[PDB]
């Protein structure tokens, strides 16, 4: 019984930083790379970054290279992404997967994911 | 380890038009993956060129 | 372009109830399923409830069946969500979406929210 | 270019119990003037010991 769960994120002006958490369980996660997926309003779903299953690989898209950065802590089965400059056109909803056979299979468990606004 | 992080760090912290929480999020990021140092500050001095009033 | 605004809410005493309305705009509304969903803030989204496109199929979460009841109108654009018995838990910023392709297939457009505050 | 300054930024950076400000001013501390290093580490840890709960 897989179980990913987000948090973090609200309302905040442009300009600003926020830091978001995914708290994972019922896996070895340590085994698993990771990955976060937004979606905007009227588009598809939209890749923003992945963290292999030990660390020190880290991947970013271009949308937000040098302004999202992506860690993990294999021993509290935690999963963070750090945003900064963020820019009227990043609110969305976040999410949280699970990678199976790294980016070769494709993604079996999501979790509820978190609203980001970014509004005056 | 990476002379580079250290050095955008210092970068960072002399930032005028920078506010406390943009400050403390960029030192985060170095803190965070090491590697994007060069990336961070690309963005950061951006972000900071934006915010002068001169 | 699609619009969606939430209206009512607000400050109510433990064990009281409120009633939300959601005005849907520039689409078809009679075919797309509509949905309401809650996030505290700092904290992620959880899934409240939702209603087909005619009507006649209701889903609701665990928390909060047999409390929160969902109805549309599709002759007026609107819908509606009434919360009862509520509780200091319940307290969120709680939001009207539209899933496209039918229930498992995610969101593509939600509105600006509104505010449930309950306390003493 | 200092050993003794670098192995101390480290240190400072990642002391638990400190908060944003105090790390980013012994930090600070490190760049103005490289012969005190020692020393403010020493201070730093000080502090960080006494601004940890149990």
């Known amino acids: 019984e897989v179980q990913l769960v987000e948090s973090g994120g609200g309302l905040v002006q442009p300009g600003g930083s926020l830091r978001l958490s995914c708290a994972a369980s019922d896996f070895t996660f340590r085994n698993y790379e990771m990955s976060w997926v937004r979606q905007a309003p009227g588009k598809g779903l939209e890749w923003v970054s992945s963290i292999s299953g030990s660390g020190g690989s880290t991947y970013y898209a271009h949308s937000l290279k040098g302004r999202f950065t992506i860690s993990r802590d294999n021993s509290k089965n935690t999963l963070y992404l750090q945003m900064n400059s963020l820019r009227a056109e990043d609110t969305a909803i976040?999410?949280?997967?699970?990678?199976?056979?790294?980016?070769?299979?494709?993604?079996?468990?999501?979790?509820?994911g978190t609203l980001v606004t970014v509004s005056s | 380890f990476n002379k580079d992080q250290q050095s955008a760090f210092y970068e960072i912290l002399n930032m005028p038009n920078l506010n406390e929480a943009q400050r403390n999020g960029f030192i985060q990021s170095l803190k965070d993956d090491p590697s994007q140092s060069t990336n961070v500050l690309g963005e950061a001095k951006k972000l900071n060129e934006s915010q002068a009033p001169k | 372009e699609v619009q969606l605004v939430e209206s009512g809410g607000g400050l109510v005493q433990p064990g009281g109830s409120l009633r939300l309305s959601c005005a849907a705009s520039d689409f078809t509304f009679r075919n797309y399923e509509m949905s309401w969903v809650r996030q505290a803030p700092g904290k992620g989204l959880e899934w409240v409830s939702s209603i087909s496109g005619s009507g006649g199929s209701t889903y609701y979460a665990h928390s909060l069946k047999g409390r929160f009841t969902i109805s549309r109108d599709n002759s007026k654009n609107t819908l509606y969500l009434q919360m009862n018995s509520l509780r200091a838990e319940d307290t969120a910023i709680y939001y009207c979406?539209?899933?496209?392709?039918?229930?498992?297939?995610?969101?593509?457009?939600w509105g600006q929210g509104t505010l449930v505050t309950v306390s003493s | 270019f200092n050993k003794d300054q670098q192995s101390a930024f480290y240190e400072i950076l990642n002391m638990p119990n400190l908060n944003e400000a105090q790390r980013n001013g012994f930090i600070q501390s490190l760049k103005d003037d490289p012969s005190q290093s020692t020393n403010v580490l020493g201070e730093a840890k000080k502090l960080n010991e006494s601004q940890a709960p149990k």
């Open positions: 979406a539209r899933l496209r392709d039918g229930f498992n297939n995610g969101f593509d457009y």
